[PDB]
Amino acid sequence: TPDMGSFHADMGSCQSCHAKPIKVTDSETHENAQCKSCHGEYAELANDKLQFDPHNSHLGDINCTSCHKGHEEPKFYCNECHSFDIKPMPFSDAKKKKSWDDGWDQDKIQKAIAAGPSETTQVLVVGAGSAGFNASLAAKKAGANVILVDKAPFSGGNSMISAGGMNAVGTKQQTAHGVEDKVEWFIEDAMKGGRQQNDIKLVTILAEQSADGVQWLESLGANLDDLKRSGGARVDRTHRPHGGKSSGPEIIDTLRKAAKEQGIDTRLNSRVVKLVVNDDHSVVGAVVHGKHTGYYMIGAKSVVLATGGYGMNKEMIAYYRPTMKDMTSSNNITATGDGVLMAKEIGASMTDIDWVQAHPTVGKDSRILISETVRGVGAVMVNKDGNRFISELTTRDKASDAILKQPGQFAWIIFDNQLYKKAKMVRGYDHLEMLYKGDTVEQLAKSTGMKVADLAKTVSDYNGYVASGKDTAFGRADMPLNMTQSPYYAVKVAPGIHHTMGGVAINTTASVLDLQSKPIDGLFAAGEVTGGVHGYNRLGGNAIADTVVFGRIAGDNAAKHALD
Amino acid sequence: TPDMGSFHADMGSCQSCHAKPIKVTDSETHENAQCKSCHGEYAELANDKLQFDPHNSHLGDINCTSCHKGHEEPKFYCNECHSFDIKPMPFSDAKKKKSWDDGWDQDKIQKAIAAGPSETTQVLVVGAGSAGFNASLAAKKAGANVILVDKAPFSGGNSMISAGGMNAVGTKQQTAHGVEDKVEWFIEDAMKGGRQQNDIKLVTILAEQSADGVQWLESLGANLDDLKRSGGARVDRTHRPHGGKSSGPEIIDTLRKAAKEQGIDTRLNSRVVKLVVNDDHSVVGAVVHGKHTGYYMIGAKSVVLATGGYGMNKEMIAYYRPTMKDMTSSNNITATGDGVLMAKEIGASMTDIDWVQAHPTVGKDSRILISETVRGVGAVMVNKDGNRFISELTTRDKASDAILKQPGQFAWIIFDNQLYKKAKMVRGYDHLEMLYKGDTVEQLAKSTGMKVADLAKTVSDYNGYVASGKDTAFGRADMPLNMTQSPYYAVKVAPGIHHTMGGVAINTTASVLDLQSKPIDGLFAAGEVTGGVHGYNRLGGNAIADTVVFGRIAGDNAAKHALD
Ligand SMILES: Cc1cc2nc3c(=O)[nH]c(=O)nc-3n(C[C@H](O)[C@H](O)[C@H](O)COP(=O)(O)OP(=O)(O)OC[C@H]3O[C@@H](n4cnc5c(N)ncnc54)[C@H](O)[C@@H]3O)c2cc1C
Ligand SMILES: Cc1cc2nc3c(=O)[nH]c(=O)nc-3n(C[C@H](O)[C@H](O)[C@H](O)COP(=O)(O)OP(=O)(O)OC[C@H]3O[C@@H](n4cnc5c(N)ncnc54)[C@H](O)[C@@H]3O)c2cc1C
Ligand code: HEM
Ligand code: HEM
Ligand code: HEM
Ligand code: HEM
Ligand code: HEM
Ligand code: HEM
Ligand code: HEM
Ligand code: HEM
C-alpha cells in the first residue's frame, strides 16, 4: 500500500512525525514542524530553476501537509486556482480519500451542543483572512483571550490573493506624492460607486479610520508605500507594497507573523458549523468541526464572524443571482458563505444580501482575472468557433452577458506580438502558462479548437476595420493595433463571480443585527461576510480597507463585550 | 357515479352549460353565465336566515364554479381561510382531482415560446388585485389595449381581504374632520416606520399622489369617507368606507366594476409562468398556463407584474427568513411570490428582498388577525398545555418569538363572559366560529386539548394576580378581568406572515430594474410584488396606497411605452 508515512516509518518510526501516543492536532502543528526539522524551511528548499516552485510562492509559509499527505494521495494546492501542468508529486500512488470537510453532520452537532463547551475562550474569531486576523489582534490588545479558527489548510482566504492594495485618506504616502484628499471625497467616491445604496454610517467610519488602518498595518511591519489610483476614485489613494509583493500577500504575511508573535494560535482545518444560542437569544459559543478532533463546542462570551464572502457557494449564487449560476469565480475555494448561513439560521438580518459582483473575463482554465486593459490595448475577443460577438470596449456588464450568450459560455481574448511586447501582464499570463500560441492564425485556430475558416474571416475583417478605422461588424470604437506580427495568442476566459457585497447586517460597532435590526448579544462580524459597506458595488481597494477598519472594530468591541 | 355535469346533462344536455363543440374557456365564462340564467344571480340566491351565506359574502360577484364544480369534488372556497363547520355541499361524492395548477412544465413552456405568440396585446397586466386593476384602468385610459390575467378562481388577491384602509395626505376627508397633515409628515412617518431604509423617492411619490388616488377610487364609486389614525401615523390619515363594506371589498368591488365598464375583462384561472425576453434583453410577452387551454404565449410590448407578495411561498420564506418558517400567514393562497421568481430568473434586481413582516397572533384555524386589543382588554395567553409563558402585554416581536418557542408553535387566547360581554370584536370571532367554549374551565380544557390541572392552576393563579394587581409569574402590569364567569372561551393563534416588503426593484416610473439597476425594456411592476416603498417595515394603510399610486403609474408608463 506504500504511504508517505510508511516510507518514513520504514526508515525510522511513527514518532519521527507523530507524538508518542499518536494524536494529530487539527492544525497538524507537530507533524509539520517535523518536516521542517529534517528538510529545512522553504528557503532551504526553494529552487529557482523551477518554473513555478511549490516551495517559494505567494501563498507564503504554510503547512507542508497542505500538499504532501501523511497517508493519502497528495494535493498540488496551486491547481486549486492555477492550471500548472505538473508531473506527479512524490507518493502520488497513495490511497485517495474524500476531503475531511464533508458538510454539516447535524446529529454530531447536536451531540456537541448537549455535551456543553469542551473548552472556553473570551473571543472566538471565525476565519483567518485579513478581517479575522485584524479582529484577533485588536481583541488581544484589549486584554481578551482569543481563539482564531479557519477551516482551510492554511490562512488568508481571498485576502491573500488580492492585488490593488488598500484605500486610505490622510496618509503619509499621499503627502509625499503631493496628493490632496479629504475624508468627504472618500465617502462621496464610495457612495457613488455603490449607487448610493451603501450605509453612509459604515462608509464614514471606513473613510475616517483608513489612514490609521494603514499605519496599523505599518506598525506590524508591512510596506504600503506604492500610492496609486483606482477605478472610481477622484484622487490617488490605494496603497501597495513598494516593489515586492502584491498587497494581498504582503498584508497576509504580516498579519500571520503578527499573530504568531502575540501568541494567538490559529487553529487550521477547523470549520465552525453552528452558532450556539441560549434561551435568551445570546450567542454563547460555536460548534467546530475539527479535521482530526471531530465535533466539539467552544463556549465564548463573544463570537466574531470573519468568514469572507459567498462567491463559491453555488446554491447561494443560484438562489440570489440565477443569471450568474454558470459563471466561474476568481475566488479562493473557502468563500462558500458559511457565516451568512450560520447567522441567517439563528435569526440575524442581512443587508443587500443578493448583491454579487462578477468580472467579465476570468480565466476559464485557470481562475485568474484577465485584466480589461488587455482588451483596451488592442486585444480582440472571439467565440469558440473564432467569431466576434461585440465590441471589446463594451461594459463589464455587457461583456459577461455577451460571453454567457456564446457557445460553451466562454470566449477567447486574442492578440498578436505587437500586443505581446506592448503589454507585460499578457506575458505574466504567458509565464503562468495561460496562452494558446500559434505561429499562424490557422495554427492558433487548431490549438484553440476554433474554426479556421471563421477565425481567418475575423482577422482579415479586423485588419480591414483597423485599416479603415471603422468597425462595421460590431462597432469597436477604436483599434490601436492589428493582427499581423506572427506568434498569435489565445486565452480562455469567462465571466466570473468576484465579491459578494451583501452579507450579515451590522451596526457601526460591528455587532451583527437581528430581525428588529438590534445587536445580537455576543455576535460580531467584519469583512466580506458583512453587508452594507459597499452598497451595490465594491470599488478597488475598498474591500481590504473594510477588512482592516471593521476587523479591528469588531475584535475590539468583541473583547470589550467579553471584559466589561 | 355522477357529478354535477351529469346530473344536469341527464335533465337537459351537455349544452345546458357548455357551448356546442365543448370548448371551455379558462375563465369558464359561458358555463357561469348559464348557472346564473337558470338559477338566478347572488341577490336572488341570497338567504338572510343563514349563518354564513355562501351566496352573499365579502368575495363579491365571483364565478359559481369558484366552488360548485362540473366534474369534481366541490370546493367550499370559504374554508381556504375560514373554518366554518358545514354539511357536505351538493355533489360531494364527485371525484377528487388535483388542482389544475400543478407548478410549471418547462417542456410545455418551451414549446409555447418556440411557437411564438398565439395572440398579441399592447399591455399585459399580470395579477388582478388592487395594483393590477389600477394598472389596467390607467393603461386603458392612456389608450393602450390591455389583457388582464389572474391565476386564481376570482380576482382580488390579498387586496380584497384588506381591513384598515388607505393612507393619504391632503384629502377632503381630512379637511372635513379638522385634521391638519403635511406631505413631509407622511414622508417622515413612512421613513421612520421603515427604519429609514425606504427608497425616499418612492415614498415621496407615494405621499404626493395619495389624495389623487383616493379621489381616483371615489370617481369610480368607492366610498372612503371614514377617517382614522393608524399605527406609526402622527395624525389621522387612513380612509375607510363610511359604513357598509370593509375597505378591501369596497376597493376591489369598485375596481372590478370599473374594469368591466371600460371593457377590460379579467382572464381567470390563467397563471403566468415565464416572462419571454427577445435577444436584445427586451421583455416581449409571457407564457400563460390556462386551466383549460394549457400553455400559450401572449406577445406584448409591455408586461406589468402586479402579482402581490410571497408570504405563502414556504420555500421563499424558509430561504429568506428561516426563523419565520413555522408561522402561519393571514394571506390569500394566491401570494406565492411568482412575480418575484419570474423577474429574478431573467435578471431583474430586487430591493430589500428578504424583509418579511409578520403579525403575532393570527388564527391557526381561521387565518384572520386576532387583534392585540383582545389581550389589551383582559385576555390571557396560554400554551397548548394551558400555561402562561409571557406577559400578554409584551411587545409584538416578543409575543411572536415566545409563541414560536412553545410546544406546537401556537398559543391559546383565553377569556371568560366578562370579556365576551364587553368586546363585540370577540363576539365577531364567535360568529366566525373561531372560539372554543366550555361551561366550566375543565370543559374548555377538554375541548382544546389543554391539561385540566395546568389550566385550572393557571386560572386560580391568574385570578389571584388580578385580586392583588401583581403578576408574579410574568409582570403583566394591568390585569382588568379574571376568569370566573361562565362560559369560558379560547381562540387558537400563532404569529403569521402578513406582508413581504421586499420584492422586484423599481424606479419612480415603475420600470423593473436589471442588475445595473437600469430599466428592463418592456417590464413594469406595482404593489407588494415590488420592494422599496416600505423599507424594512410596512405601516398600516400604506400598502393599499402603494397599489393605487404605483399601480396607476405602472399602467400609465406601460401604455406610453407600448404606444409612443
Ligand atoms: C482575485 C481577487 C482579487 C481581489 N483584489 C482586491 C483588491 O485589489 N482590493 C480590494 O479591496 N479587494 C479585493 N478583492 C476582494 C477582497 O480581497 C475580499 O473581499 C477580502 O479580502 C475578503 O476578506 P475577509 O477577511 O473578509 O475574508 P477572506 O480573506 O476570504 O477570508 C475568510 C476566511 O474564513 C475562513 N472560513 C470560512 N468559513 C469558515 C468556517 N465555517 N469556519 C472557520 N473558518 C472559516 C476561510 O477559510 C478564509 O480563510 C479581491 C478578491 C479576489 C478574489
Ligand atoms: C388580511 C390582510 C389585511 C390587510 N390590510 C391592509 C390594509 O388595511 N391597509 C394596507 O395598507 N395594507 C393591508 N394589507 C396589505 C395589502 O392588503 C396588500 O399588500 C396589497 O393589497 C397587495 O396588493 P397587490 O395588488 O400587490 O397584490 P394582491 O392583492 O395580492 O393581488 C395579486 C393578484 O395577482 C394574482 N397572481 C399572482 N401570481 C400570478 C401569476 N403567476 N399569474 C397570474 N396572476 C397571478 C394573484 O392570484 C392575485 O389575485 C393587508 C394584508 C392582509 C393579508
Ligand atoms: C509531513 C512531513 C514530511 C513531508 C511532507 C516530507 C516530504 C518528503 C518527500 C516528498 C520525500 C520524497 C521526495 C523525493 O521524491 O525525492 C521525502 C523523503 C525523505 N524524507 Fe521526508 N518529509 C517529511 C518529514 C520527514 C522527517 C521527519 C524526516 C526525518 C526524520 C524526513 C526525512 C526524509 C528523507 C531522509 C527522505 C529521503 C531524502 C533524500 O535522501 O533525498 N522527512 N520527504
Ligand atoms: C516546508 C515545507 C515542505 C517541505 C519540507 C516539503 C518537502 C518536499 C521535498 C523534500 C520534496 C522533494 C525534494 C527532495 O528530494 O529533497 C518535495 C517536492 C515537492 N513538493 Fe514539497 N514540501 C513542502 C511544502 C510543499 C508545498 C507547500 C507544496 C505546494 C504548495 C509542495 C509541493 C511539492 C511538489 C509539487 C513537489 C515535487 C516538485 C518537483 O517536481 O520538484 N510542497 N517537497
Ligand atoms: C506506522 C506509522 C504511522 C502510523 C500508525 C500513523 C498513524 C496516523 C493516524 C492514526 C493519523 C490520523 C487520523 C485522523 O486523525 O483522522 C495520522 C495522520 C497523519 N500522519 Fe501518520 N502515522 C504514521 C507515520 C507517519 C509518518 C512517518 C508521517 C510523515 C512522513 C506521517 C504523517 C501524517 C500526516 C501528514 C498526517 C495527517 C495526514 C494525511 O493527510 O495523510 N505519519 N497518522
Ligand atoms: C504554491 C502554490 C502556488 C504557486 C507556486 C503559484 C504561482 C503563482 C505565480 C508565479 C504567480 C504570478 C506572480 C504573482 O502575481 O505572484 C501567481 C499569481 C496568482 N495566483 Fe498563484 N500560485 C500558487 C497558488 C495559488 C492559489 C492557492 C491561489 C488562490 C487561492 C492562487 C491565485 C493566484 C492569483 C489570483 C494570482 C494573480 C494573477 C494576476 O493577478 O495576474 N495561486 N501564482
Ligand atoms: C355529459 C355531459 C358533459 C360532458 C361530456 C362535459 C365535458 C367537460 C369537459 C371535457 C370539460 C373540460 C376539462 C378540462 O379542461 O380538463 C368540462 C369542464 C367543465 N364542465 Fe362539463 N361536460 C358535461 C356537462 C356539463 C354540465 C351540464 C355542466 C354544469 C352543470 C358542466 C360544467 C363544467 C364545468 C364548471 C367545467 C370546468 C371544470 C369543472 O368545474 O369540473 N359540464 N366539462
Ligand atoms: C355550472 C353551472 C351551474 C351550477 C353551479 C348549478 C348549481 C346547481 C346545484 C348545486 C344544484 C343542486 C341543488 C341542491 O342540491 O339543492 C342544481 C340543481 C339544478 N339545476 Fe343547476 N347549476 C348550474 C347550471 C344550471 C343550468 C344551466 C340549469 C338549467 C338548464 C340548471 C338547472 C337546475 C335544476 C333544474 C336543478 C334541479 C332543481 C330542482 O328541480 O329542485 N342548472 N344546480
Ligand atoms: C351565482 C352563483 C352560484 C349559484 C347559481 C349557486 C347555486 C346553488 C344552488 C342552486 C344551491 C342549492 C340550494 C339553493 O338552491 O340555494 C347551492 C348551494 C350551495 N352553494 Fe352555491 N351557487 C353559486 C355560487 C356559490 C359559491 C361561489 C359558493 C361558495 C362560496 C357556493 C356554495 C354553496 C354551498 C356551500 C351550498 C350549500 C348551502 C345549502 O346548504 O343550501 N355557491 N348553490
Ligand atoms: C363565500 C366565502 C366566505 C364567506 C361566507 C366568508 C364569511 C366571512 C364573514 C361573515 C366575515 C365577517 C364580516 C366581515 O368582516 O366582512 C368575514 C371576514 C373575513 N374573511 Fe371571509 N368569508 C369567505 C371567504 C373568505 C376568504 C376566501 C378569505 C381569504 C382570502 C377570507 C378572509 C377573511 C378575512 C381576512 C376577514 C376579516 C376578519 C376580521 O377582521 O374579523 N374570507 N368572512
Curated annotation (Swiss-Prot), chains A, B:
**What is said about its interaction partners and assembly?**
Homodimer.
> Which UniProt keywords are given for this protein, alphabetically ordered?
Electron transport, FAD, Flavoprotein, Heme, Iron, Metal-binding, Oxidoreductase, Periplasm, Signal, Transport
Q: What is known about its induction? A: By anaerobic growth on Fe(3+) ions. Not expressed in cells cultured either anaerobically with other soluble respiratory substrates or microaerobically.
Localisation per UniProt entry:
Periplasm
Residues covered by region (Flavoprotein-like): 112-564
Q: Which residues take part in binding heme c 2? A: H8, C35, C38, H39, R195
Give the note describing cofactor binding and stoichiometry: Binds 1 FAD per subunit.
Q: Where does heme c 3 bind?
A: H55, C64, C67, H68
Positions of fumarate binding: G164, S371, E372, H498, R538, G541
Q: What is the protein name stated in its UniProt record?
A: Probable fumarate reductase Ifc3
Q: Which gene encodes it?
A: ifcA
Native source species = Shewanella frigidimarina (strain NCIMB 400)
UniProt GO molecular function: FMN binding; metal ion binding; oxidoreductase activity
Which NCBIfam families is this protein grouped with?
A: flavo_cyto_c (TIGR01813)
